[PDB]
Amino acid sequence: YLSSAILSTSIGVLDMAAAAADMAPNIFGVAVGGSRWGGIPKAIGAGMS
Amino acid sequence: YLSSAILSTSIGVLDMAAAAADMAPNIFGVAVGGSRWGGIPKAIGAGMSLAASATKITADNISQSEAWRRRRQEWEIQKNNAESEIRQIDAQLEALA
Amino acid sequence: EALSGEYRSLVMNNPVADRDDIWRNLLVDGKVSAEITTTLLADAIAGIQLYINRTIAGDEPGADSDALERQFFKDWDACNKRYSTWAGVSQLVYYPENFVDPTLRTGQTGMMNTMLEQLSQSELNKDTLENGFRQYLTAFEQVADLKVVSGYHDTVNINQGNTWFIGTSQTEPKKYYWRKADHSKCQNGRFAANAWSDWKEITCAVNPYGDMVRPVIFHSRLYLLWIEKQVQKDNTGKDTASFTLKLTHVKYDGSWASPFSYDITEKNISGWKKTGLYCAASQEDNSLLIAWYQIEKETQPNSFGLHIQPDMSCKKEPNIAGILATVTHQLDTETTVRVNTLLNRISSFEFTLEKQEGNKEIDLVISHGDYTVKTENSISALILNPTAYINITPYKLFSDIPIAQVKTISSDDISMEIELNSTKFETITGSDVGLRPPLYPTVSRETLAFPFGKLSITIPAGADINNLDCTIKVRFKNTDVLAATTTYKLVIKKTDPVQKVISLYTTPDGAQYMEWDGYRTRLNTLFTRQLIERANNGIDAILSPETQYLPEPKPGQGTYVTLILKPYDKNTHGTNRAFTIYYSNDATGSGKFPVYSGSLSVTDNTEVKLFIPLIKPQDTLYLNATYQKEATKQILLFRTDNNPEGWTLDKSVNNGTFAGLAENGVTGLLQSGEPMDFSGANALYFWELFYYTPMMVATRLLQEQNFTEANRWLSYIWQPAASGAGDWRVRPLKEDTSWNADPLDSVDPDAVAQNDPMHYKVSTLMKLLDLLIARGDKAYRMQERDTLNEAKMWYMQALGLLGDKPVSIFSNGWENPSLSNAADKTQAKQFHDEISRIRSGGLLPDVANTLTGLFRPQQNEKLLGYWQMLEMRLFNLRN
Amino acid sequence: EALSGEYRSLVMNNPVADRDDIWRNLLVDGKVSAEITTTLLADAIAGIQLYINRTIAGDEPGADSDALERQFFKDWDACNKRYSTWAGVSQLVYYPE
Amino acid sequence: NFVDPTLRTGQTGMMNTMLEQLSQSELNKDTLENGFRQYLTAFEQVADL
Amino acid sequence: ELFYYTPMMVATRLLQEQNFTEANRWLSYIWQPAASGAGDWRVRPLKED
Amino acid sequence: TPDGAQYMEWDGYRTRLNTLFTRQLIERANNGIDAILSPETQYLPEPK
Amino acid sequence: DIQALIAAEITGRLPTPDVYNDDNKLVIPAINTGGKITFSELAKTQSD
Amino acid sequence: VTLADFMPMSLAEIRSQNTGRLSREEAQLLHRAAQKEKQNNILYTARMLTRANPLLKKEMRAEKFVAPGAVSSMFSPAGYLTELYREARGLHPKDSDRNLDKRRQDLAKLVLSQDNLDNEISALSLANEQLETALMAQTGKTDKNKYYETLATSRRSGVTPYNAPFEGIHNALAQRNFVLPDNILSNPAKFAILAAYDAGISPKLYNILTEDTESLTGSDLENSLKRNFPKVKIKDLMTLDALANYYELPAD
């Protein structure tokens, strides 16, 4: 149970790094964009959960 | 419970293959792109959460089996109580004879 | 009561004293009732224990503080305070099997942990017992397939410190792991099996580009580091590719921090091809020198640098092609992979221990904690330690307030006065510290400390930095009445240890190895590429000794050599029985590398087998030997062709003998393959799979009373042979393989039993005795006639296993010595001296009386418990 | 007790031998009390079982290793060692129901 | 007489979560060190601010 | 917290659950008897009130 | 400060806001709890 | 139990109460390496 | 030889001996080398001793193994006591008044025999022997009974005026539940002394309690204080704890 709780709190870092990586645009060319504006609030919420 | 824990840890592979497949661009043409930059950290996290879930499942499995073992120990104590009460009642019947 | 009153009235000369003061002064309690009976040794023990407690708690002033700061008293409360824990701790070196638990072990891998987790239920049928093992084996296969990507060496001398490795998995995506090879457990190019850590996973999402990952130790903390390439497209049609440097580290709880990122793409790394990155910490200006460079046949045609402060802020190093110029031996090329070491200091400091010391009563020695030079000035950190012990004449000696000297305040008493090339700069502690070490604790031999705070000593000017930078000296003075001075010389000098290269290779047939100065250490193992075929036949085929003898390609280019040596002759070997055999290339005078050390045998040939690497890039090799007499003559080993196993037996005109082998037996020169190694890098995984897993499953089935399957699982380890001795089916037990060189640095039985696997033999047989006695008891409680015969059967089997009860001698050489004659320091010194003599093989023994000193070795009370239990049960069966 | 002493003095030609060596050499226990009753087939069975255990554990040197590497002895501990599991395993071909 | 070494007013969340994880019955050196490494991670983060 | 309240908590938490040889190890991070008369306080703000 | 220290400087005083303890604890922490909690850790210096 | 006899005869007071009454000699055993018992006798002159 | 003499010593001892010879880093290197050699030697002996394991005799210096509980066993209370003594006898200087040998002179002469380890004695008897061997050394008398006879009249502490014989009489006599001043067979003119002995009072204690201290002044009071407090200083006795310890009565 202790290892499970520690694993469950040691994943917010990854979930927030994922959102920070998603904030960068991924569509290039004549139309640019693709960032995920709500990625960081969503990831803070996922870390809270 | 054991099969459940094993299923819960044998899915990180799929969840990470999904993210690795998502890292490839899916929008082509004049605008190219569509990769999912956070796919791989998100999938590592999802695998961690599955390991935590399966760890709690196997903890519950061990707790269950231990509850049953303590139950059997109570039962052995009760069986010895009654088994010695039989000997006592037989000695009592001999005293009565 | 009356005697006590009169005692403290007459002897103690203090009639008002409490009666407990007699207890504290005489180490005996008088207030006991007349029924409290104790032995006489036990009363002596209780007395000396009370004495040690009172003198360690300060109630007996005047104690030897130096003696109280000694391992026996340092481990006082934990171990030596009570006879219970002293005996229990002392028995742990001799009978670790009494404390070894086959389930819980220190350093148990996560794989074994999760398998024990899944065997921790009560219903262990063959289905769960095989599913657990298949899952363990999947995890084992993954951790055995790891190939090493890159490394980083901790210190600057590659014979010390640790080497961090980064291994990747043979999956997709790749999973990155890290180890550590402690070189402080590495003699003769041979890592102790416990010098290696476990492969530990890097949970961050590391997605390098072109296999550029680098570990680096930055402020004692492991940092990972990789370069990430990401394909983009301009607003115009052109499609670029952006590069990012990512940098993360382990947090204290073993998780990995979220990686920082630095945009790297500047018009040129996009243009390189086959690049590689470099990373090393700095002993000066604590930072991280990172540098990506182009690769060609030669290293670093172009290279861009970067400095990183501990606040993790970019600071572009503008001229790094000059810094990479000095460490080009650590940089990758198109064909080699080399591990980096930390950056050398530009100027190595040296401190002559003394010039003069003045008053030879206070030792007055200093110690330069840290030292470096800034852009223009040399900073240092100093601590000063005097004696300050008893016999400061005259005496009072009642009280110390913190014709004679200063018993009062010691303000500004100590001072350092560095002497520069012509000038000097004199700083006194009254200008640094408000903390004053008091002469109290007046109790003797207490030394004091005077810490100085980061003495930024300004300034070296007009001096060639650093060509003639040897400042004359650094002198300080504990100026006080009856106090002295000492001086030290600063010998800064620019040095350059060149081309101490440590590289990683991968043979065409799969083997990896780290090749450092003159040795090769195999990093990975090809066991899993061959286990895969055994594994279809089942656990019985995976765990059979044929799996444990599986071959392994030889690391790189070189030859195996099986040197056979004659027994000890006093003429050819000198006096000492030890021998070490070297090899060289050999441009005689080019240095030779010790490849094996050992104790040469008496009345028997000793056979030492090696692997002599070919590093020099007729490939010559020259083997020696070194005895107490002298170092023998070389022996050529060469080859004419490019055959991998072809190395000429009995090379040219040289005799082909050291005079220590003097036989036709040298060869062992073929066999491109050696067996699987149980004391190398992957020793832990092999030992788990082949011993610790069956022992765990067997002890886990014995509990929960599955005897017919506990026996099946123990028979994977030991199995009785038709001949006398048993058939050990675990290879490292069959050929006693020590795989823990330093086992007494911790109170754990597994380290001792790993250092000496005969304890694992005894532990296994004790589990078997457990099993047989439990089967006997189970059949003996089903009280019918045939089951009673079966129970007698199981007990007789356990008795036959145990053997013949050892008779306990009582008429023995044990005189009844006095305590003082039993507790001599000469008695311990002579013992340890003879052992250390006979251990280095200084000569043969005296022939052979005493091995353990004054007190005799004891029989294992656990074995005697087995003996007594079997005798009791057999008595009840016979009656 | 007296017969055993004289036995190992005269027959075994080793008067210093332990009395259990008579047990190991003659496949019968003499130290039993006078109340331990067994049948005669059962004593023959216990004797041959002790013999097979001792020769399979190497205490009876000179055995035929080729014969010891035979299915009956390979399945010795699991099935054929005790009458219980020999009978239970033999019945499994005839009455699997 | 009234100070309780476990419950204190103004106790940080770090100390709260460490006491949480030491509140079981099996306090062997492994859990006792894992708890302290985790406390120390949180402490390091709140000290770097 | 780090230097006093954490060892006191772990020591009182090992004293309960009766781990005496480790409760003593953890109290000896705070106070440790000195060869001189007075004890050796190993927490700086206690050593200098 | 260039060496890491922060401080709020108000009318005529300075109050140190942060601490550089963690940049030096990191090296003690590898030796274990016994080295983290020893008084030498508590005397660690701090830029002015 | 026979070792207790041998030990009390080699160090203690056995045979009770006196010894040496065999033509002014004395033969006392000596056990060693747990697996042997060796002998070593004494003698005396015609005093008294 | 060299590294064998520094095995028992600590780093501070090594640093403190030959302060002029050993450096402060040479001493640390030597201490590490000594401890490592000690560990390796202990491992060597343990490894050679575990070859003699009865379970491994089928696969094989089997010199001497003693039963558990034997006094010669290296894990016995005798070995524990040897370790304690070797480590404790050198904590205070030999001239110091707290030295272990000097404060317990019977320890160095203590013989580690099986009979010492096994035989049970009364702890109180051992305390009393320890006190007697010092009190008779002070007095100079070697006879125990002559010493107690001198002890029967002396008043040099608040518990001292006691008779071994009279206490025996009184205990033996009160064990018969016999009341002296209620005998038909006595001198009714000696009822006072008889009831005193009944309460239990040594003849010397009676001589003490019958003096006429009230209304006694002059040099006679000096005489009486020198008689009734021969060894204590009255001013040092004045305090409450001193009065509680002199008469062995509770302070409260």
Side-chain angles (χ1 to χ4, degrees), chain C residues 212-231:
Chain C
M212 298 194 255
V213 202
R214 283 288 199 214
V216 58
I217 306 303
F218 183 27
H219 286 117
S220 318
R221 173 187 260 163
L222 173 78
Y223 278 74
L224 199 70
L225 173 77
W226 68 96
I227 278 180
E228 190 150 338
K229 178 178 177 301
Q230 158 187 320
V231 181

Side-chain angles (χ1 to χ4, degrees), chain C residues 61-63 65 388-390 400 439-447, chain F residues 35-37:
Chain C
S65 72
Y389 72 96
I390 200 79
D400 273 346
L439 255 60
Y440 205 59
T442 193
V443 312
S444 193
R445 190 36 196 67
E446 61 101 315
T447 70
Chain F
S36 71

Side-chain angles (χ1 to χ4, degrees), chain I residues 10-79:
Chain I
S10 71
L11 188 38
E13 305 273 42
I14 296 189
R15 191 170 292 141
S16 158
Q17 303 173 12
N18 272 127
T19 82
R21 284 210 158 159
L22 268 300
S23 160
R24 206 176 161 278
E25 196 57 75
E26 289 174 352
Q28 167 158 14
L29 277 272
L30 181 72
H31 168 76
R32 288 183 190 161
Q35 302 293 340
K36 197 62 166 55
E37 195 153 352
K38 182 175 190 275
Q39 291 179 10
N40 290 328
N41 295 325
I42 286 156
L43 287 171
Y44 183 80
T45 69
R47 173 180 316 152
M48 280 188 80
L49 286 177
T50 180
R51 300 182 191 285
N53 209 272
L55 286 165
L56 307 173
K57 200 170 202 217
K58 237 180 256 164
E59 308 185 348
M60 307 299 304
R61 312 196 54 83
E63 287 148 6
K64 325 293 198 282
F65 276 1
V66 293
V71 78
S72 58
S73 150
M74 65 163 77
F75 310 132
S76 65

Side-chain angles (χ1 to χ4, degrees), chain C residues 53-64:
Chain C
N53 298 348
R54 285 185 50 84
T55 181
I56 208 165
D59 291 323
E60 314 267 348
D64 195 7

